[PDB]
């Protein structure tokens, strides 16, 4: 399953956040490594 | 160098933060990968 990567989503701080998605890699297939996303908190 | 590994520290939200450092998905040898530590916020 895609979400089997370790999620390091930057918890809301300093008026900035990062939706960082990085592989832990024994997995195969699944949706490719999703990149970090920016949005105000 | 030391600043080469990608920083993925979690901040203080809901009283929990995580500091884990890992290298980029694309360094040879050098200092080992630093482990995570837990601290109250």
């Amino acid at each position: 399953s895609a979400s089997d990567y370790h999620t390091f989503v930057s918890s809301c701080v300093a008026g900035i956040q990062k939706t960082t998605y990085m592989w832990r890699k024994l997995c195969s297939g699944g949706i490719s490594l999703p990149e970090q996303r920016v949005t105000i908190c | 160098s030391a600043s080469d590994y990608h920083t993925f520290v979690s901040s203080c939200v809901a009283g929990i933060q995580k500091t884990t450092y890992m290298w980029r998905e694309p360094c040879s040898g050098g200092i080992s990968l630093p482990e995570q530590r837990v601290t109250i916020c």
């Binding site: - | 160098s1 080469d4 040879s28």
Partner: protein
């Protein structure tokens, strides 16, 4: 002139004690044939030693003399028994001037330790005056024979005598039992890393990360600093590579490592087939550093 005194042809002056006694051969003129070199003829038709006079002196240069046939080899054998050391046991340099027309071979051969002659270089065709230097790997009995063939094809009669090989300049370095045509400066061998200097009067050390050349003894001019990303060896004979190259970049410093690359590897080229059935493949033994 006895060893320890150098002459240019008009007068012989004694070598100063400050300079090491260096004996070397130089034959710019040939009014008298040197005792070291002897001439012989190898008949091309029968491949037998004719015993004739292969080369004739002319006072200034020695050329090839016509024998029974122009195909016969015009040998001129020069033999040195050993090499006197002051890689540089013998740096022999030639001045070959060939006015020959066609099928012109100068089989300059070298016999290492009185082995069977192996042709180091084989000039072909008409060539002008040039300097050729040959290197002797180790001290031994070495003979330089300059076999000449006016014509490869065989034709009756000596119709080709214009093909002559002029060798008017011979220099042999570090010879045993020879005349001292020029004395190099020096009187003990300085330790590795120290450049021999006669004006200073004492063994002087080269600056760090520099390699010294023994070909030019006097001064630090022969002592050359090493290249980028290298270290000087304790012998100063050749620069050493630390296998770790560190270079600067705006972001940070890059330190490429080649420690595991010191060991040799056996990587060969693809099997290559000759023009005929026989096949080969180049194999290169690489030792990067260490």
């Amino acid at each position: 002139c006895p060893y320890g005194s150098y002459s240019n042809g008009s007068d012989c002056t004694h070598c100063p004690a400050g300079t090491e006694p260096a004996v070397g051969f130089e034959y710019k003129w040939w009014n008298t044939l040197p005792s070291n070199m002897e001439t012989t003829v190898l008949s091309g038709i029968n491949f037998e030693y004719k015993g004739l006079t292969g080369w004739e002196v002319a006072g200034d240069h020695i050329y090839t003399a016509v024998g029974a046939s122009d195909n016969d080899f015009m040998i001129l054998t020069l033999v040195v028994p050993g090499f006197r050391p002051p890689k540089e046991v013998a740096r022999i340099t030639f001045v070959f001037e060939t006015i020959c027309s066609v099928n012109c071979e100068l089989y300059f051969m070298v016999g290492m330790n009185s082995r069977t002659n192996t042709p180091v270089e084989t000039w072909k065709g008409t060539k002008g005056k040039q300097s050729y230097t040959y290197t002797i790997e180790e001290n031994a009995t070495v003979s330089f024979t300059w076999a000449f063939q006016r014509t490869t094809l065989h034709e009756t009669g000596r119709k080709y005598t214009n093909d002559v090989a002029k060798i008017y300049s011979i220099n042999v370095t570090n010879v045993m039992g020879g005349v001292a045509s020029y004395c190099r400066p020096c009187c003990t061998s300085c330790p590795a890393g120290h450049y021999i200097n006669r004006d200073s009067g004492t063994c002087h050390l080269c600056p760090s990360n520099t390699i010294l050349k023994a070909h030019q003894p006097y001064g630090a001019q022969a002592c050359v600093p090493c290249g980028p990303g290298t270290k000087n060896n304790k012998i100063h004979s050749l620069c050493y590579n630390d296998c770790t190259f560190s270079r600067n970049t705006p972001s940070r410093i890059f330190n490429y490592n080649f420690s595991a690359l010191a060991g040799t590897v056996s990587l060969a080229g693809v099997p290559s087939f000759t023009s005929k059935g026989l096949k080969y493949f180049h194999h290169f033994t690489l030792s990067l550093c260490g």
